[PDB]
Structure formats: structure tokens, C-alpha cells
Amino acid sequence: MAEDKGRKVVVSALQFACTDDVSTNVTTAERLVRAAHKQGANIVLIQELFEGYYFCQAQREDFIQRAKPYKDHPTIMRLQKLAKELGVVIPVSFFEEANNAHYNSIAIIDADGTDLGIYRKSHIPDGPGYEEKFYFNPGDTGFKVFQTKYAKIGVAISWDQWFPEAARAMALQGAEILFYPTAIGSEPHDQSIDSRDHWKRVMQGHAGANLVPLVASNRIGNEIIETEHGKSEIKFYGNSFIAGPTGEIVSIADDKEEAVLIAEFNLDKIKSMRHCWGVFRDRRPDLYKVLLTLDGKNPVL
Amino acid sequence: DKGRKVVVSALQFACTDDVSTNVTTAERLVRAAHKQGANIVLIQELFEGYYFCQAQREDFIQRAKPYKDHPTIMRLQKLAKELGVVIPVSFFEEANNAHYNSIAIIDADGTDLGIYRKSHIPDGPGYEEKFYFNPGDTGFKVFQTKYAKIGVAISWDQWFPEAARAMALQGAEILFYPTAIGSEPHDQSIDSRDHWKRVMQGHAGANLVPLVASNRIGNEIIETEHGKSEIKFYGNSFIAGPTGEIVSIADDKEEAVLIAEFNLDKIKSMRHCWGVFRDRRPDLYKVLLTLDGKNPVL
Amino acid sequence: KGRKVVVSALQFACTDDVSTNVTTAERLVRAAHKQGANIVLIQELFEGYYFCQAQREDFIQRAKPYKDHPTIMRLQKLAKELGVVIPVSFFEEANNAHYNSIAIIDADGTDLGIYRKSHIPDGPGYEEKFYFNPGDTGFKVFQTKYAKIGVAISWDQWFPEAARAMALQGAEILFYPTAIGSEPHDQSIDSRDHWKRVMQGHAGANLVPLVASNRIGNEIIETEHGKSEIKFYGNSFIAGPTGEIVSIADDKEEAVLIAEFNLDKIKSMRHCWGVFRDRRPDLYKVLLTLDGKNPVL
Amino acid sequence: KGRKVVVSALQFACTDDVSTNVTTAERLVRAAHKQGANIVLIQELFEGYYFCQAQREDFIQRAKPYKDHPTIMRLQKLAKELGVVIPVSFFEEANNAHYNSIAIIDADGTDLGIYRKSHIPDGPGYEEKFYFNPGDTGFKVFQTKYAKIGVAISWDQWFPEAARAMALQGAEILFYPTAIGSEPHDQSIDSRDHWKRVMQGHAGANLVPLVASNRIGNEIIETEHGKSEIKFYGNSFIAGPTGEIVSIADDKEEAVLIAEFNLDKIKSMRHCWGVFRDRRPDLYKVLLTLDGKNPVL
Amino acid sequence: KGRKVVVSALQFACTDDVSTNVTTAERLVRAAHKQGANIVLIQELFEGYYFCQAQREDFIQRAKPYKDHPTIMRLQKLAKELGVVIPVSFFEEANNAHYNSIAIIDADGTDLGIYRKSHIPDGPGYEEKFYFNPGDTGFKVFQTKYAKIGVAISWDQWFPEAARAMALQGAEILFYPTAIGSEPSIDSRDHWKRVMQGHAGANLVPLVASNRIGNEIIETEHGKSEIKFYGNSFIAGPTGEIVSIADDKEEAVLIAEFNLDKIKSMRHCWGVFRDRRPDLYKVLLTLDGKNPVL
Amino acid sequence: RKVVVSALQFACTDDVSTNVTTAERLVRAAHKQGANIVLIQELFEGYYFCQAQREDFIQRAKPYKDHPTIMRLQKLAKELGVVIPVSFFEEANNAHYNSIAIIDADGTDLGIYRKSHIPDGPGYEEKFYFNPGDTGFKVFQTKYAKIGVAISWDQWFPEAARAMALQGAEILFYPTAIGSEPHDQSIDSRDHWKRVMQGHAGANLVPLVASNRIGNEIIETEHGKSEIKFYGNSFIAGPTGEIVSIADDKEEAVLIAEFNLDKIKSMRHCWGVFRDRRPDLYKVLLTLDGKNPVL
């Protein structure tokens, strides 16, 4: 009796705490990637801006200079080594310097060690605790998919995950799995804001509407940043998870543990399911021009 | 709790294949909803009869009727005006040689505010809608009622984030989806109800607007061109709030009246402060105007 | 005297094995070339059975990318070896979209592009809407070594708008690869005469010849509700520029049909007759509605 | 000899009451009119305190739609009465988008349309990116009774690209209503000389006059993390077409600045100077990057 | 703390004898170095009188090729001897085309490449196109031992786009060798400085300008033309503030130290480059404000 | 801005290459007489073929794209530095037009205008050949000036001149081929033709240029020989309508008038008639029958 045929891929969401020291956090990442591969993982997802604290609680001049070029990046070069050694795909999130522009970016490292390129975060959040608009130009790559040894994947970043347009754009270009490294928690100006359920439901919705699985890796722990106006704290709420192509959660972490989440998907069965459900056959792009507005009337240039 | 408040309702009932029975059933539940305080009441898809799209039959097409002087619409305008409630009326539209799965929005004073024509048309065993309906040519609309600016789409439209975003971008404060979905006659292992909820809950959370879904219940057996075909409609009518939470839900067999109050001033303030509309990137969305990921449609 | 072009319609039966059917196509293309053909037309979805009687998940996966398609690549070699133009019908996968498509191969083997079927039929026996996104190429014409040609697919042939669109853009000949027969739900529907008249109208109205290649044979497909059967009724034909039939096959024979046209003299006939001079696009806005009143977005 | 135009920059301190502040605008506009002004410029967001020191939910709901805006409508009445052109800065709600916008009223009261602020500043004291979508009108010029003018907003004034965009589309005069002062996290920043120089640069590069109107006063805002204070530094000015300052206000008093320009003489001095006939747009592609290599989508 | 760099603007009067002028350039480069200069700017076309003033067929001879240029080669030796970066303005012959050009020499004497003057006035009061084709290099930056630098030439000075183009590409200091004066009505010295302070301010990069001084009489098609070049060479900082300036009549050696790391951090925090909108800048690739050029 | 303009008036054979030799040699004399903008008569590539309605004549038409004649008149436009409008019979897929291409002084081809008003009747069976044009009226900005180019029968319609002058036209231009009628030798149209055009100039305050064919022409039709005598009277009119240079009905002519156009924009702008117009009252000009707007 034969196994069910089709390409299988094992994916992983990792969840951990960071210090504001880069060598410590990269060592933490190698360790969890290694544990993930030991559980059979093929593609492994590390959370947003893992090289340090989530520094965007402050709006500081000196924190802008934590950016580094994409070219010859020490963290990327090191994880390229790991990727080739274990035979796994590793997206690497980093703060990019590009002449006078800066971006929250992610380089996709393939399972032979090859850097396949970058995605630059398109949607940039703002407000207390999450002052990203001060640091990052809005991304200019557009939504991208990457052909890896195991799959065509879509990778976007954190706040991108709240936007249906991004998931769909990746899916229309052939993405077979979506990946969202993330940094999200409490909000220092209002301790009654607890966004964790809202956060999951919106992404489950992307998974179900595009009929693709979806991986989110989010940070844990409390971090305190010195700001222009005193110290500010966020408690990162974990809840890393993996969802299947109906938006079912197949694996989930809690709000405090370090975790290695693992799941297997038959990409050929899911392809077949995605097409028979028919949503991509029935879409109406002739009726979607209003999505190219911000205000419901006026197309942007 | 200061601000403009509005009470919405999802209804859920079984249909026969006789229009008079079904409209009497609708009148009964609209009155029950109003009794419980409702301002806007949502009746399910194609509620005038059995869900006839299980078959592909010449005679079934001639069930359509013109938007103009439609008797079912005209009768609920009288009810809308009597109770001062907004009532969207789903009907099978004939428009010269075109046909549409449509919906007419009656305001609380009985005024017909216009129509929306279903945009996304499903197909497959049990749900052969592409055989009857021209794909919709109104575009996604919003309507200004006495109580709120609302966005109404139809059934299968509910699977498409593009449709919810289009209504929200145009100022819709609450979304409405009358529906008819159940089992599928070619495969008894398909159970879409959780998948169906999750995708709608995602629209509500991504646009931060409340969302109302009225779905049919009961078994319906149609005589098709190839023999009997049966669907069991699974109910699960629900109301979701602006973060995607279910605040009110029905099971898969009970007749129901569901009721929720929403404060639109607070929800507006919340939707804006969360920031997604401030942060969208239409400059990077051109690929949504493709089907194949490469070629923009004409 | 003037530019002459010999066209051909092919009519044959299919199994559901690709290699068999392509072998068949190749055999008939060669036979037409031996009789002088420059442009040879193979029927719709000739790679296998007309599977659209069913609405099946597994049949959707018969589709294949346009890129490096093994059937198009095979027939490019044949085009080249023969110096003929060969429109190649295939079921296209393009990411999550799917189309009933056709690639136009020039007489030097060059893939000149594609047209994605625009009008998608539906109903018992012909459940095409389940399988194909409505085409997004628009109507096209293709400059080949012999002629500017307009190629659309099957059900497109019932629409005068398609023919007109092609002719306005310079098509000098129209081609319609086709799959059409009886209807499994009503044995009394016989569409063959109706089908011809409508196509003859297009030919007469635009003053351009027209070529239609249709399938033959009984096909029995297993569907969600049991067996379903179509007898395909052949009647592949070539019409001239006043819509007269110059060549026609019966409803069961395998056939190779040949006809020669003087394209310069037809052009001059088409201009002289006046219609493209007298068209009133100022008064045709209603054709951009479905319902006779509301223009589509 | 030629078309003369008298333009004015206004400068004043704002209170927390809308209708008080619009009356303040009315009084200074009347005073500019009396001294002969044809086009009068009011500072940015003059309806109230500069609220952008804070990032607050409730402050967002201070926005109002462009349609039937009561401050725009009141100012239309005044433009018509006095025969002056008045651009009106306001916080726009447009369904779920919000912008920092300006409506250009013509000397007969006619509302010519709006520009939405393109470049949105950020940082302590000036958290504008929390409130405004980046503008989607693009740079505009408006044809008024007296002159084609280019109006942009505040932070837009640091970008040579905006001033050039407007001059290329025919602006004869540039206007920049502004709100700028000290910064709450660093009392060592005094940007007023820098801010002047950058604008004087635009005037001189395009050979067009330029008007800037800036707020004065200390404003304390209750933020999400406590009181934050800006001292607005005035220095409203008018510059000539070589970038010379012809009129300038101090850092704490109300002012009405007046300057006359001969627009036909300046136009002629611009054509002669030839910079526009000598530009190299074939070499300017890199301006469509952020990072000096990748063109934006 | 940070990379500190000393830059210099030189100003002198030219004779119309080449050896004399190159000897003058060398004397003043050495003097800049003696005061600590790391990068030294010589004014445009310094090997002689400013001749674009005449429409003389004979002055076309003065152009020499980029390859093996006697003046460039001599200045290469001096760059390598003193450890200083020297951009060298010259009149380039290249194959039936001619350009107003400049070649960047690094502190080790390496020839890092060439920029060609992009904007060429077809004015009613010059036929400069007579000598120079419009440049085909586009705007460049060169990585030197001390800094990334952008260099442009004479009329380029007027064009905000050229300064922005160099800045987008990492230029940390801009250099503008020029030559400007007028007949013995108005004088453009303030207009010039204001436009240039403008570019430094908008890009938050320091900016060095070297302009000649002196009267010069050339015989021409009509007869005599005379120009009094007005000097005012200057160095400006990253907010456009003038930190050193020359007068209209004497030789000068201007010196200023910049901390390029502090300036980088200031430039990025001010935020102009984070906030640019290239999606709304297309009209800049038109001449007439409506039609794109090729 | 002192622009010089010319009307030309010459004989045609039915031979493309020779006729192009005559335009060549009269354009050259225009330019030697100081001409900036030089006009060439309608369908000058051969005889006025529209006396017959024959199928083979429709096939005289040519694509706009890489047109033999356009391309040669472009080399010459470039070399002399003169602006030259070029009449030709246009093929466009199955459509056909009576069309004109405006060539600037650097040889630059600036775009086409397509004859809007199509004559009909004996000798002038133009409705048989030409689709009514779909370009609209057009003003081409050239190096020398904003110019208004329409074709032949267009000269009869005040709306066409008025439309061109609302769009910035400083000069109007009309290449033409009119003369005797073959059905009725009593009909003399030369004074009537001159006068209608003079009434436009006056009404818009813009100079006007009408170039026209001379010489006799027999065409073999579907019904026998057919003869027009083309009467010239190629003329330049000023902005009051006064004719300033006028050719005869018989001989080859090179006309010239200098105009101070910045001075004529002042005469016009100051006369007040454009701002005096009442477009709220002109809806009736969008009907054919005097009450039903056309769709």
C-alpha cells in the first residue's frame, strides 16, 4: 500500500526571546533552526528583526544607524552557511541600508545556500511602541514570490500580514505557502489593547481565501527601550502558528514559551484543492480598480 | 457608550418552492427582528424559492423577473416603510436578455435605493450558477440608509477579500452577505462551514467593520436534467464585530433571529486609529487586476 | 494574379491518449501539406477527449503551462519542417488561472503568441465555465508568412463581435477550431445547421473567408452523475468571403479540406463593397452593455 | 509694463477654538487686501493648535470632509467679497483615508480643487505620518484670475522635486503654508536658517517668486506620554525670482507681508535664462529611485 | 568620533599660457595640502582663458583626448605625492565629439574615471554648443580614499536634479568647478550662491565651489569681449551655511573639515530621503511638463 | 515672431514620381522666397480620381506608416527648415481616409488629421472613397507656430475654423482641389468658395491659406470620360479676411505673405470676440435637423 503521492514540504515557525546583543540572538536562531531540521523541517521561519530588540519603540537618530547594506551582510552570510549545511530554506530579516534609503527587509536563502533576493516591507506601521514609519522607507520591491528547492513561497513582513492585498498578490503569482515573520505585543500607551485574536483571525482569513498554508513567527518576552521621553515596555505575545489552506490552525504556540512548530503539507493536493474550490477562476479584476484608490474614488498615480 | 448606534439582524429559515409561503415567512421574521429592536434586517439569498441552481434547466431561467415593478420588492417596501427598517431584497433579475443574481436595498422609509448585481458566480455540482447569471456589472456598491452607510454583496461574493475591501474603501460601515451554502452533492465529505466563517471573519477584522451573514437551512431536493439532486443547507448564520469576533451565531437547523447593536462612531474611530487604511499601498496592488499574476485584464 | 494562400481544415476522432492524438494530427497535417496547404487548422482540445462533459477536480489538472509545452514544441518542429502555419489548441495553466488557449505557430516554427478563449459556454455536455477563466487576451490577429490571420476558439464562433473585432484589426482569414455535437440532456437538439449559418454570416459580413475544424466520433465520459455521451457531428467547412461554402465534410468521415484564396482580390472586393467605410461606431455604445442599458465597468 | 500681482504672507498665533482662528485669518486677509494684495497665504492647519505633537485616536476624528467644509465655505465668501485668491489648509477625511490638504479659492469665490500633502514628516513634535496618508493628487498648478500658481504644503517645501514639478506645469509663483518650530526632544535644533535657504534655492533654480507663511507662538499639547511643547518661529517670507528675500517677518509678532511682482517680465527673464530649455530629463531617471538604483513601481 | 575629511576650494586668475596655469594650480594645491586638505578643487578649464566666449574654429584645437592627457598625468603624480584627491577639469577630444569634462584622481594617483558636463546652454548670448556636446556620462559618484564624492561642472550648477542624482547614489560631498562673471549691468553672484546653498541644504551634504577671478579679453567674430570673473568660491555645509568664502579679486585657498559620519547621521534623521515620493516625480522626465522624453 | 507662409498652385499628371518632383521644386522656390511654412494641394500624388467610383482606385490608398512620399518630403523639410503639410490617400486596416500629415522643420512627423466633411455629387464622389474622419479638428504646434490644418471641403464649414481657433490656431491652412462640375457647366464656384473662407478669417481674426489645383483632367469612369477644369485661385487671406496674395485660374504660382503673429494675437485678444462668445446658447450646432442632438 503506497503513500499518498505529491510533493511534501515540512515547514516551521520558531518563537523566542531576544537580547539587544546580535551574537546572542543569532546563536539562539542557529540553535532553533537546527532543532527544527532535526524534526524534519525544510523551510524555517525566524521572527522579525531578530538581531536585536524591537527598537522601534523609540524615534532615535542613533538607532537609524543600526541599518546595514544587503551586500556582504554578516548575519546573512552566516545563515547562508547554515542553510547549505542543513539543506533548508531560511528567510533572513534585517534592517537594510541602501545609500540614503532604509528598509525593513528580508533576504530569501535557498537550501543550497543561494541568496535568491530580497523583499522590502511595503506596509509600515505607526503609533506608540511601533514607530516604524520613522525608520523605514515604504518598500519598493512589490510583493514577490521565490522559487526554492522545495516550493514557490511568498514572504512578507509583520504588518504586511494585516493586508489581504498582499496575500492575494503573492498567491496570484504562484506562492504555494505564505510566511510572515512578526514582532507584535502589547501597546505602551493603552494596556487594554490585546490584539492577538484579531491578528490570528485576519491571517487565517488570508489562508482560507487563497487556499494556501500560512506560517507566522512572532517574538516573546518583555523588552524595555530608552526613548526620547523615558522607558517604554512591550510584552511580546508569541502565538506563533501554522494554518492550513482552509485557515485551520494546525499548530500553535502560547504567549511565553520558546517554541519550534512543525507541519507537513502535500503541495500537490492543496494545489488541486485550491483550483477546484474555484475562487481564482471566478475573480473579477475588471471590478477591482477601486482597490487602486486610498479614498474610494481617486486612483493613485 | 456615546455615539450613533444601529441594531442589525440575521435571519435564518427554510424555504418551500412556493413564493407566497416564503414571503409570508420573511415578513414574519422581519417583524420579529423589529420587535427585538432591529434597524436593518438581512433576508437570505434567493429566498423566494428552492435554491434551483442544482439543476441546469431552460425552464428555470424563466423564473427571473424584471427589477421594475417586481412584486416581492414592492411588498417588502410596504413592510420597510411600516416598521422603519432597512431590508435588502434578493431576487432573480431579468434585464432584457441578460440575467442576474441581484439585490435591491430598501431604505427605512420604503424608498428603493437601487441594486447590486452579484459579481462572483460560482459553479460545480449543486451550485451551477454560471449557467443562469451574467456575471454582475454594477461593481461593488455602498448605499446610504437612514441608519448607516452599508455595503451589501451576495453569497459567493463573500469568499473574496477584494469585495469587502471595495465596500469599505467606499465608506461602508457594516457588510451584509445573504447566502445559500450547504453540502455538495458530488462529495459528502466536503463540509465548508468553518472555512466559510473564517474567511468572512477575516474580512471583518481586516477592514474593521462588522459583518452580517444570513444563510439558509433545511434539505432541498431538485429534479435535475440527470435525476434528483439534494443539498442540506447548514445555517450558521452569524454576526461578526470589527475585529472578526463572532458576537452572535445560529446552529445548522434552527430557524433564527440574531440581533447585535454596534456603535458606528466608536467603530469608525477604532478603524482609523488601527491604521490599515492609512498604510495601504495601491501603487503596489496593480497585480490584483490580473487573473494569472502577470497580465492585466482588458 | 495577387497573393494566394491555400487553407485546410482537418476533421478526426480523438482517444484520451495525447501521443496517439498528436500522431493523428501530424499525419493529417502532412496530408494537407502534400495537397498544397499553407495554413492547417486542428480542432479544439485535440490532445484528448472533450472532457468538459464532467465537472471534475482531477480534470482541471490536465492543464499545462504555455511555456515549454510538449505538444506546442513538437508541432513547432513540424511547422518548420513543412513551412506551414499551425494554430495549436491546448488547456493552459497560468499560476492559479486556467484558459482554453491557442498558440499560433508560423511557417518558420516561431511561436507568435496566444489567444485565450473569450466566450465560455455552459450547460449539459459543455461545462466549460467550470474549467476556464474567461479569456483576457482580447481578440487578436497574427501576422504569419502568408497572411494576417484571426484565430478564435469554438464557442467564440457564435459571436459577430469576435469576427468583427478580428477583421477591423486586419484579419484576412478567420479560423475557428471547434468541438461540438449532440447534447446529452436532450437528444432532439441538432445544432449543425444553425452553427454553420452563424459562421457564414460572419464571413459574408466582413468579406473574409472562414475555416472551421470540428471533431467527429462518440465520446463517453464518466461524470459526477454517471456516464455522459456526445456524438460529435463533424461538418468541418471552409467558407468564402460572401459566406458560400466551398468545402465541407460529412458527420463521420475523417477529412482533409483544401481551398485557395486570392487575398489581394478579396481585399479589393471587401473595400469596394463598402461596409467598413459605412460603419457607425458612434451609434454602437450599446454593445458595451449586457442588458441593453448599462455600460459595463 | 505687464501683469502685476501683489501677493501676501500672513503670520499669526493659533488658539484651540476653530472659529476664533478663522476670524483671525479673516482679519489679516482683510488687512492684506487693504494694502493691495491679490493672493493671500494663510499658514498650515490654522484652524487649531498643531495637534501632531501627539499620536492620539481622538485627534484623528478632527478631520472633516472636503465637501461642504465650513471653513472653506466661509473663506469662499470672503474671497468673493474682496476679489482675492485664498488657499485654505485643512485636515481632510475622505472615507477611510485622511490627508493634510489645501483647497484653492479663486478671486470670484470659485473652489478650484485641492492639493494633498505629498511628503509627510515624522519624529518628536511632528508625528504627521500617524495622521495623514501620503498625498495622491500629485503636484498641481491652479489657474487663478491673477496668475497660474503652485501651492504645496509645509514639509513639501524641503524637496526640490516639488518646486520643479510645479514650475514645469506653469506655476508663476510658489506658495508654502507652513507649521514649523522648535523640536521637543532636542532644544539644540534651530532649523530656521536652513529652512529659508532650501526654499530660496527653489525660487532661484526655477526663477519664480516664492511665498512662505509660518505660525508663531508656544503650543503645549497633551500627548500620550505627557505635555510636549513647540515654540513656533515665524520667519514668514516672500522671495523674488533669484531667491532674494523681499519681505520677512520676525519670530513672534503677527505680520502681513506684501510684495509686487511683474509676472510677464519675470516670465521673459525665465525664457531668456534658458534653464528649462536646457534640462536633461534623459539623465534624470535616478530621481525615480529612493535608493539610487531601483526604480519604484 | 568619525571619519573626518578636509576639503579645499582654490581660486585664481588664469593667464592664457598653459604652463603658467598648471604651475599656478600646483602651487595652490601644495598650499592646501600644507593646511591639511585631503581633497582639493581647481576651477573649471583652468589651463587657459575661458574661450567658450568666442565662436572660433581655432580654439577647437585646444581639446585633447582623455587618454594620456599631459595635464591629467602631471596632476596624477602630484595627487600620489601628497596623498590628495584632485578632480581635473579639461577640454576633451573624443572621436569627432568634444566635451567639457573632468577626471577624478584619487589619493594614490589612480584615475577613477570621468564625468562630462551635462547641461549645455543654447542661450541667445552663448553658442557654447559650438564647442561641447551634451554629456553622455550621466551623473556619477566616485569612491575615493576619503569619501564618496559627486562632481559636476559649470552650468550643471543651476540644476537641482543633478545634485539630487549624485546624493541618491551616496555622494557625501558635492564639487562644482565653475567659471562665471559678466560684461564691464546686473551681477549673478548672489543668485548663484543661493541656488547652490539650496542643493547642500536639500541633500544635507557639504558642497565645494571653485570659480575663477580676473578680467579676460578674447578677440572674436564681432571683435573684443571682456569678462570680469567674480570669484566668490566657497565651501558650504550640509544645511547650506557658508563656512568659508573668497572675495571677487584675490587668490584664495579655502579649507574646511567635515565629519562625514556625523553628517550621514544628521542627513538620515532629518528624513528628507525617507520621505521622497518618486511615484509623483515623473513629470521631471519631461521638458514641457506633459510629454516624457526618450 | 515674423512667420512667412506660401500657397502653391500646380498641374498634376497621373504619375506619383513626377508630381512629387513638382512639389519638390515649388517648395524649393517657396524656401528661396523666404518661406517658413509651405503648403501643397490636395491629393497632389496624382489626378483627382474621385470623378469615378471604381474599385481599383480605392487600392491607391497607402498606410500612414512608412509612406513613400511622406518620407521624401521629410528629408526636404529638414534640409530647408520648412514646415510642410502632406495630403495622401490613407489605408488603415479596412478603413480609408482623405488625410494630412504635418512635417515640422526638423523633418519630425507631428501627426495626422483626417478629412471630417466628405463631398458628394457628380465629379466629386468622395463619399464612395473616404470614411468620414475620426481624428477631430487639430492644431499642431510647429517650430514656427500653432497651425490649423484641415482638408478641401472642410473650408466650407465655420465650425471647423472656429474649432481650430478655440484650440490656439494662429494660422489656418486648407489644401484643396475644386473646379468645374462635369454635370452642369453653368455652376461657377470660385467667388463663393473664396468668400466663405474670408468670412472665417474675419470671424476668428486669423490669417488663412488655401492652395488649389489648376490644369484640365479627364478620368475614365464606370460610365464614360469625365472632365473637370480645376480653377486655382490659391490665395492668402489676412486676419480681417482681406486677400493679400491671390493666384490666377490658369498658371503655376508660388504665393507669399509675412505676418507678425504676436501682433495678430494682440489684435485678436483685444477685439474681445472669443470671451464674448455664448456656448450656453450653441447646443443647436450639435444637431443636424435643428432640434435633435446627435448621439
Numbering used by the authors:
A (entry chain C): 1 to 301
B (entry chain D): 4 to 301
C (entry chain E), D (entry chain B): 5 to 301
E (entry chain A): 5 to 188, 192 to 301
F (entry chain G): 7 to 301
Quoted from the paper:
The arginine route involves three enzymatic steps: (i) arginine decarboxylation to agmatine by arginine decarboxylase (ADC, EC 4.1.1.19); (ii) deimination of agmatine by agmatine iminohydrolase (AIH, EC 3.5.3.12) and (iii) hydrolysis of N-carbamoylputrescine (NCP) to putrescine by N-carbamoylputrescine amidohydrolase (CPA, EC 3.5.1.53), with the release of carbon dioxide and ammonia. N-carbamoylputrescine amidohydrolase enzymes belong to nitrilases, and more precisely, to C-N hydrolases breaking non-peptide bonds using Cys-Glu-Lys catalytic triad. The octameric MtCPA enzyme is assembled into an incomplete helical twist, made by four tight dimers with swapped C-termini. As in other nitrilases, the substrate hydrolysis is carried out by the catalytic triad, composed in MtCPA of Glu48 (proton acceptor), Lys121 (proton donor) and Cys158 (nucleophile).
Instead, we decided to construct the MtCPA-C158S mutant. Substitution of sulfhydryl with hydroxyl group preserved binding properties of residue 158 but strongly diminished its reactivity. The structure of unliganded MtCPA-C158S, determined at 2.39 Å resolution, presented significantly lower noise in the electron density maps around the active site when compared to the unliganded wild-type MtCPA. This improvement allowed to identify the ligand bound inside the active site as GOL. However, GOL does not penetrate deep inside the pocket and presents no direct interactions with either of the residues from catalytic triad. Instead, it is hydrogen-bonded with the side chain oxygen of Glu187. Considering the fact that in the MtCPA-C158S mutant structure, GOL enters the active site, and mimics the substrate or product, the niche-bound GOL quite likely might represent the secondary binding site.
